[PDB]
Amino acid sequence: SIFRCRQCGQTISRRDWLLPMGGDHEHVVFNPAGMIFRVWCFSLAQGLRLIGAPSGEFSWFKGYDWTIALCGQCGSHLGWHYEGGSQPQTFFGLIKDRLAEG
Ligand SMILES: COc1ccc(C2=NO[C@@]3(CCC(=O)NC3=O)C2)c(OC)c1OC
Ligand SMILES: [Zn+2]
Numbered sequence: 001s002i003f004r005c006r007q008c009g010q011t012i013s014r015r016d017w018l019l020p021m022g023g024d025h026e027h028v029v030f031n032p033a034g035m036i037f038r039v040w041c042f043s044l045a046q047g048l049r050l051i052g053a054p055s056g057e058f059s060w061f062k063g064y065d066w067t068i069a070l071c072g073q074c075g076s077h078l079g080w081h082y083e084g085g086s087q088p089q090t091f092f093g094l095i096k097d098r099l100a101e102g
Contacts, residue, residue: 002102003094008074010047012099017044019091021061027093029060039079039093047072048092050081061085061093069094 003013018025021041030036049072054065064082071078079094
């Protein structure tokens with residue numbers, strides 16, 4: 001029901017806050033460093049620290065710019081905040097295997 005940071009237990013999100021972006025909350029993507037992530041889209045998240053300004057470079061989601069999302073408590077990379085788009089304007093893409101569910 002609740003998602004916490006797997007490393008430290010920081011409160012991050014909720015199953016209720018999952019967002020089906022393009023018809024599915026789960027998107028399997030790879031970055032240019034060939035790292036594969038199972039990304040769960042959330043309308044809402046808390047307890048993160050968004051670092052830097054947004055970038056569109058290699059964005060997996062058309063029309064959205066990303067900011068790196070760390071755990072605000074432990075600094076572990078938990079995913080990205082997406083902004084600059086439409087329906088919705090913003091959302092979170094969190095790496096499922098870096099969260100723990102209650
Ligand atoms: C030009 O320098 C980079 C900028 C962004 C990234 C990204 N890695 O993950 C990102 C972030 C989130 C996203 O929507 N898609 C990706 O692919 C961008 C990158 O790879 C490590 C870079 O090294 C080449
Ligand atoms: Zn943490």
